[PDB]
């Protein structure tokens, strides 16, 4: 039956300079005219990789690690954080002078404007300080939050919010994620809607966060310099994104 390939963004579709390789555009091209379905599965927020979708013409994807799945321009599945819990977190973070940034499918908003930790960390991502809206979560679907505090301070948050998971990405900022959910469960929901079968699914990843995915699909492709534990669970290890990794891999796999 029909075959489908899921790509993640960092180190996979985009290179180290965050540019789109010429050979990847070719790859996706050949893949489409060949009848193979192309999609994306990432931990990123939709608005964070809109340019990639526009460039490759991809409108089906698993985002927020499976908490927001879109099939051909439409929302197939969505599981935002529990409103009550986002509030409690906000109020608790506020009491501690720790700011938060709320992310929904379209944008981000800070609970505190012009804050030093948001500036430095967000700038490391090459982003300006998000506009300030302390009550943005009240009538919006918040799929994720950014907690701006040091590690020596996350203890209470981690302790008081077991339904959440914390993954630090900067000295003064950590991702606040939902416990339930995964790219694999997102990838699963889509192949069911597409009538595709596990064995007919392929996936390219680069980070620790892709293990669950590479493990679940019929053919998981790890990449050149991906973490050793990512290659371990992979069914195939291709070259780095820097060396036509997507193209070469798709070739070896006889997909193009």
């Amino acid at each position: 039956g029909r075959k489908i390939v899921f790509f993640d963004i960092d180190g996979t579709l985009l290179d180290e300079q965050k540019q789109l390789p010429l050979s990847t555009i070719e790859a996706v091209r050949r893949l489409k005219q060949s009848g193979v379905y192309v999609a994306i599965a990432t931990g990123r927020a939709p608005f964070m990789f809109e340019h990639v979708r526009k460039q490759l013409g991809i409108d089906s994807f698993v985002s927020f690690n499976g908490q927001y799945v879109v099939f051909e321009g439409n929302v197939l599945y969505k599981q935002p954080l529990r409103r009550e819990k986002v509030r409690a977190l906000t109020e608790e973070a506020h009491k501690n002078g720790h700011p938060l940034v709320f992310m929904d499918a379209e944008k981000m908003r800070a609970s505190i404007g012009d804050h030093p930790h948001i500036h430095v960390s967000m700038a490391s991502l090459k982003f300006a300080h998000p506009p300030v809206d302390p009550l943005y979560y009240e009538n919006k679907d918040i799929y994720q939050a950014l907690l701006f505090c040091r590690a020596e301070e996350e203890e209470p948050y981690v302790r008081n919010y077991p339904e959440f998971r914390f993954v630090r990405w900067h000295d003064v900022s950590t991702d606040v994620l939902p416990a339930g959910g995964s790219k694999a469960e997102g990838i699963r929901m889509m192949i069911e809607k597409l009538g595709i079968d596990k064995k007919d699914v392929y996936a390219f990843g680069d980070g620790l966060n892709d293990i669950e995915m590479l493990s679940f699909v019929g053919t998981g492709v790890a990449m050149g310099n991906a973490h050793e534990e990512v290659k371990r669970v992979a069914d195939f290890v291709t070259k780095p994104v820097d060396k036509e990794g997507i193209w070469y891999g798709l070739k070896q796999l006889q997909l193009i």
Side-chain angles (χ1 to χ4, degrees), residues 11 44 58 71 82 107 158 226 242:
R44 285 192 180 183
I58 294 179
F71 180 62
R82 257 159 283 128
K107 54 196 162 200
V158 177
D242 189 56

Short mmCIF file of all heavy atoms in Angstrom, two decimals, residues 11 44 58 71 82 107 158 226 242:
data_model
loop_
_atom_site.label_atom_id
_atom_site.label_comp_id
_atom_site.label_asym_id
_atom_site.label_seq_id
_atom_site.Cartn_x
_atom_site.Cartn_y
_atom_site.Cartn_z
N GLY A 11 18.57 19.45 12.53
CA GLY A 11 19.54 18.45 12.11
C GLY A 11 19.03 17.45 11.09
O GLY A 11 19.77 16.57 10.65
N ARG A 44 8.56 20.91 17.98
CA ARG A 44 8.34 22.34 17.76
C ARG A 44 6.88 22.72 17.68
O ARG A 44 6.01 21.88 17.46
CB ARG A 44 9.02 22.81 16.47
CG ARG A 44 10.52 22.96 16.53
CD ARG A 44 10.97 23.72 15.29
NE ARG A 44 12.41 23.95 15.20
CZ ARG A 44 12.98 24.65 14.22
NH1 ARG A 44 12.23 25.18 13.26
NH2 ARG A 44 14.29 24.81 14.20
N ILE A 58 4.41 21.43 2.72
CA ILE A 58 3.99 20.33 3.58
C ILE A 58 2.89 20.84 4.49
O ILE A 58 3.13 21.74 5.29
CB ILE A 58 5.18 19.85 4.44
CG1 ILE A 58 6.25 19.23 3.53
CG2 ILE A 58 4.69 18.89 5.54
CD1 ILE A 58 7.48 18.74 4.26
N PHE A 71 -3.76 17.41 9.62
CA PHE A 71 -3.82 16.61 8.40
C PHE A 71 -4.35 17.48 7.27
O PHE A 71 -5.47 17.98 7.34
CB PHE A 71 -4.76 15.41 8.59
CG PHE A 71 -4.88 14.55 7.37
CD1 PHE A 71 -3.76 13.90 6.85
CD2 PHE A 71 -6.10 14.41 6.72
CE1 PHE A 71 -3.86 13.12 5.71
CE2 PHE A 71 -6.21 13.63 5.57
CZ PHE A 71 -5.08 12.99 5.07
N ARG A 82 -4.07 21.33 30.62
CA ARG A 82 -5.29 21.58 31.37
C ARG A 82 -5.29 23.02 31.89
O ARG A 82 -4.39 23.44 32.63
CB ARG A 82 -5.42 20.58 32.52
CG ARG A 82 -6.43 19.47 32.24
CD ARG A 82 -6.18 18.26 33.12
NE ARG A 82 -5.05 17.46 32.63
CZ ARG A 82 -4.03 17.08 33.39
NH1 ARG A 82 -3.98 17.42 34.67
NH2 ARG A 82 -3.05 16.35 32.85
N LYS A 107 1.06 31.47 18.42
CA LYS A 107 2.04 32.41 18.95
C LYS A 107 2.42 32.20 20.41
O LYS A 107 1.93 31.29 21.07
CB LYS A 107 1.50 33.82 18.78
CG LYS A 107 0.12 34.01 19.38
CD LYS A 107 -0.54 35.26 18.87
CE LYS A 107 -2.04 35.21 19.11
NZ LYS A 107 -2.75 36.16 18.21
N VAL A 158 8.67 21.18 39.62
CA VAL A 158 8.73 19.77 39.29
C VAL A 158 7.89 19.00 40.32
O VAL A 158 7.05 18.18 39.96
CB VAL A 158 10.19 19.28 39.32
CG1 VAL A 158 10.25 17.79 39.05
CG2 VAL A 158 11.01 20.07 38.30
N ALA A 226 23.94 12.09 14.86
CA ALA A 226 22.89 12.05 15.87
C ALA A 226 23.48 11.39 17.12
O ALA A 226 24.53 10.75 17.04
CB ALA A 226 21.70 11.25 15.37
N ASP A 242 24.38 17.77 6.61
CA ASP A 242 25.40 18.54 5.93
C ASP A 242 25.94 17.83 4.68
O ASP A 242 26.53 18.46 3.81
CB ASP A 242 26.53 18.79 6.94
CG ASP A 242 27.56 19.77 6.44
OD1 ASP A 242 27.18 20.90 6.09
OD2 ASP A 242 28.76 19.41 6.42
#
